[PDB]
Design a protein around this ligand. Structure first.
Ligand code: BEF
Ligand SMILES: [Mn+2]
Length: 128
């Protein structure tokens, strides 16, 4: 994918946002911004330029399932890639996110290899 692709990394825990941003850097992506919940995320997204979202689920203000649903319903960003990265491992959580339009789903804790593989899976799917 284009190394100038702009990422928004969304999670209410700074430790996890820091993990993801550093992994992206290693993969060659330095155009990376952060958001602390789905409301903060939407404000950043509305400001423009984003080409990929990596998002937690459990967050205050607006959770990641609601964020994914909002993105997918909005005409301006309906096909924006959204990778869910979350501690929720139950099949019903994976179903709800998949059915809501998740581009992919990674369960915490995850390895560096897993994040790279699932990102690449999405790039290939979208021809990026
Ligand atoms: F809080 Be996230 F769903 F891991
Ligand atoms: Mn969380």
């Amino acid at each position: 994918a284009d190394k100038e692709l702009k990422f928004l990394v969304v999670d209410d825990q700074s430790t996890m946002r820091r993990i993801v941003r550093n992994l992206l850097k290693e993969l060659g992506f330095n155009n990376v911004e952060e958001a602390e919940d789905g409301v903060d995320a939407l404000n950043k997204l509305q400001a423009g330029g984003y080409g990929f979202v990596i998002s937690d689920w459990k967050m205050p203000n607006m959770d990641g399932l609601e964020l994914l649903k909002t993105i997918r319903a909005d005409g301006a960003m309906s096909a924006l890639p959204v990778l869910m990265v979350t501690a929720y491992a139950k099949k019903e959580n994976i179903i709800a996110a998949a059915q809501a339009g998740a581009s992919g789903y990674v369960v915490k804790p995850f390895t560096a290899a897993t994040l790279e593989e699932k990102l690449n899976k999405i790039f290939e799917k979208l021809g990026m």
